[PDB]
Amino acid sequence: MGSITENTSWNKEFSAEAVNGVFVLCKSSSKSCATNDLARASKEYLPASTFKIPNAIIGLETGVIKNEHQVFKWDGKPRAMKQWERDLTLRGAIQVSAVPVFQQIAREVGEVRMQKYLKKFSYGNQNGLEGQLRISAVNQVEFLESLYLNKLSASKENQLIVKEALVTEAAPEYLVHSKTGFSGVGTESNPGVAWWVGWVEKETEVYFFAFNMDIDNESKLPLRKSIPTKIMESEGII
Amino acid sequence: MGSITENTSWNKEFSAEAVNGVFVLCKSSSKSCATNDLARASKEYLPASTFKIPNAIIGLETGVIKNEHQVFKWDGKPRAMKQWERDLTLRGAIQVSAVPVFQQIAREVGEVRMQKYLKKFSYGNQNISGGIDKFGLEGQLRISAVNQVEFLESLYLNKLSASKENQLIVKEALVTEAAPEYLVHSKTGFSGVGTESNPGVAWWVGWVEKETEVYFFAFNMDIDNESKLPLRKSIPTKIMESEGII
Ligand SMILES: [Co+2]
Ligand SMILES: [Co+2]
């Protein structure tokens, strides 16, 4: 966000769970973010399901998604996960991380048009067989800020629609917009990535966060939520 | 639309607690509603804090509220509730039910423009007389449950005489519980207590997004004792739970 600061005490939470990752946190009025690893904060990883955010905005922007009330009806073919084998709203599709739904959105937007929006959005970047899209935590928090401030190259309507769909928790005092990613299990040599991106609105303040971690045990996935919670709890947030 | 339908069956929980109230419930796809009392459903009551919903939209439309990231700054003047003595966002001012913040908005909106948008929303009997900004809590403005539900349907579907973006802002301001399987939008209302013949009213109005479906509700009850209040939340819940919603 301009200047990024190291908070090495955060690493205690990671080390207690034997997890290699990075948490990035930004207070909105600060225009400067904090982290546990300076080098890993700006390091680019596959967005996985977190890509469903810029996906949903382009999908609306192109008219591929007509409006917020559009249902994505199940065609009949057996999908990879059971949770996906039902009709879905926009929030439904996002929260169950229904890949096929967004694959179909991605097809009828197009590879070139998608790329045009990703450029404008400044969402991650590309790299001679393919070169998959990767994104840095620093880029996530920058991304979500522009989404929150309504400052993306999209209508405010379309940004607002996606934001409600990103609502994951709600209490009288705070509102949590978040999205999870998981690229798959990996090895110790070559690990998968787990994401949690979002922001926490509390009081008159806003905190943007991007967390990622190496994952080589199925069982450690839920840690993508406890590490960022325990840090934000002791920071004095939630 | 479709219809409303008395179902005395729900009265169970009301008798259970000696509560004179009404629930309206409406399946959106079915385009139809269901209640315990057709008579009380159409009976118009003081909106109280449920009135913040319209006031938010009128405030956004009129430019009074600049946008969703507007901060309503606390001057340092004492307020009736500890919870109001802090700076507030839109969601904040709606959640803690901050009377003075919204009273300020009503006054910057004016009687004229408050009539304008309230006419356009078909909000209640639309009658705002008496006091420039008291019409919600202890004024002349009154609204039915069915009307609440009607209004809230128009909000969900962005059908109001107000821009979509302002409609979406307030819709987010109303999120009160989020789960993977469903989302919840509501406001509470509460006019006061006691009798001297005439008892107070207590509202809970919202809608629930469950899978592909969505259920609109408005609820009110008669309150003469302060304690039976949480039943404004719990009773409508218990019924939705039985009907299989949450
Ligand atoms: Co928000
Ligand atoms: Co909603």
Curated annotation (Swiss-Prot), chain B:
The modification N6-carboxylysine is found at K52. Dimer. Coiled coil: none annotated. It is an enzyme of class 3 (hydrolase). Its main location: periplasm. PROSITE patterns: BETA_LACTAMASE_D (PS00337). InterPro entries: Bact_Transpept/Beta-Lactamase, Beta-lactam/transpept-like, Beta-lactam_class-D_AS, PCN-bd_Tpept. SUPFAM superfamilies: beta-lactamase/transpeptidase-like. Optimum pH is between 6 and 7. It is found in: Periplasm. Disulfide bonds join C26-C33. It comes from the Bacteria. Its EC number is 3.5.2.6. One of its GO terms (molecular function) is penicillin binding. Class D beta-lactamase which confers resistance to the beta-lactam antibiotics, including penicillin, carbenicillin and oxacillin, and also some cephalosporins. Confers weak resistance to some carbapenems, in E.coli strain C600Z1. Acts via hydrolysis of the beta-lactam ring. Has penicillin- and cephalosporin-hydrolyzing activities. Keywords: Antibiotic resistance, Disulfide bond, Hydrolase, Periplasm, Plasmid, Signal, Transposable element. Belongs to the class-D beta-lactamase family. Changing V99L: Slightly increases catalytic efficiency, about 4-fold, with respect to carbapenems. Decreases catalytic efficiency, about 10-fold, with respect to some cephalosporins, but about 80-fold, with respect to cefotaxime. GO terms for cellular component: periplasmic space; plasma membrane. This is Beta-lactamase OXA-10. It catalyses: a beta-lactam + H2O = a substituted beta-amino acid. A beta-lactam binds at S97, T188, F190, R232. It comes from Pseudomonas aeruginosa. Activated, with respect to most beta-lactam substrates, in the presence of 0.05 M sodium bicarbonate. One of its GO terms (biological process) is cell wall organization.
